[PDB]
Amino acid sequence: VPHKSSLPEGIRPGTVLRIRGLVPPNASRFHVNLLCGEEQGSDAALHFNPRLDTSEVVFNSKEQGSWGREERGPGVPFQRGQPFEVLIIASDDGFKAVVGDAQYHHFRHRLPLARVRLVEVGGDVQLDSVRIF
Amino acid sequence: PHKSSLPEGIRPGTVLRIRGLVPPNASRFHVNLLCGEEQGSDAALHFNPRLDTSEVVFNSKEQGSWGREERGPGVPFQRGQPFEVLIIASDDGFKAVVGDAQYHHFRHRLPLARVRLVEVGGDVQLDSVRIF
Ligand SMILES: OC[C@H]1O[C@@H](O)[C@H](O)[C@@H](O)[C@H]1O
Ligand SMILES: OC[C@H]1O[C@@H](O)[C@H](O)[C@@H](O)[C@H]1O
Numbered sequence: 001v002p003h004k005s006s007l008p009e010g011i012r013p014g015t016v017l018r019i020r021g022l023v024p025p026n027a028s029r030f031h032v033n034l035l036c037g038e039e040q041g042s043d044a045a046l047h048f049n050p051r052l053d054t055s056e057v058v059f060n061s062k063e064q065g066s067w068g069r070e071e072r073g074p075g076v077p078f079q080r081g082q083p084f085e086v087l088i089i090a091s092d093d094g095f096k097a098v099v100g101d102a103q104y105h106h107f108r109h110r111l112p113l114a115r116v117r118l119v120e121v122g123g124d125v126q127l128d129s130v131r132i133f
Numbered sequence: 134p135h136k137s138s139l140p141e142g143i144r145p146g147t148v149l150r151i152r153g154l155v156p157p158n159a160s161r162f163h164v165n166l167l168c169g170e171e172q173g174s175d176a177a178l179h180f181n182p183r184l185d186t187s188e189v190v191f192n193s194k195e196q197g198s199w200g201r202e203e204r205g206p207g208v209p210f211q212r213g214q215p216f217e218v219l220i221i222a223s224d225d226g227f228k229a230v231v232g233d234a235q236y237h238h239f240r241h242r243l244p245l246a247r248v249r250l251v252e253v254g255g256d257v258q259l260d261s262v263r264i265f
Contacts, residue, residue: 012145012223
């Protein structure tokens, strides 16, 4: 299910994205994108890409159709056949990624938080819910 | 009377996650964000679910006196039931989330930078209190 949540007014420091779901057996990878528009090729303030097939999580941004330098977190905190809960929290200096009870990584802002207009979740994941507080 | 200290306070983006159960014969419990360890210290936020009178009260305490009470819509808590609460600090206030929904937005009355301690007390069965 390619999930999309529209955020007309954008987000601000103090915004929390909570994503719950299940990593199916044989999943290769999935992603959570914070995009700056609803069209194809829109800039991505955040590309959060857990890769079960290569065992790592990649963070990146996309601007003018071109990717920035990837950041990687300490191992993959997801497992095939197991549910998970991810909190992506917007702060003044970056996005904190919390995976089930522990801070996993901090991704410093590359694009203005104010330009984020859409959240998309896709890939090999079976979503329970996506809530924005 | 669970106390979790926050040296270097909290800022926009700080998230408080509280998990526990409301005892079967619970009257009320509270979550306080205080500006000091000493008793009677100022409270930037007082979140007080009252199961006896069926109302959730929000308030602050400055120089010993309670401020103007604010109430959320109804009581999202039930006796004998487990719960998860998120208190999110932003630039304009604290967002209280109960379950899967935003319950109330309490706008700042005291400086966020004066927040030094979190306290959870009253009739509540605490599972965990995590700060992100
Ligand atoms: O840097 C992030 C990008 O890395 C590429 O290797 C991948 O094909 C893209 O889908 C995206 O994940
Ligand atoms: O308004 C907040 C305060 O209200 C009082 O009536 C109560 O005794 C205090 O414990 C606190 O809840």
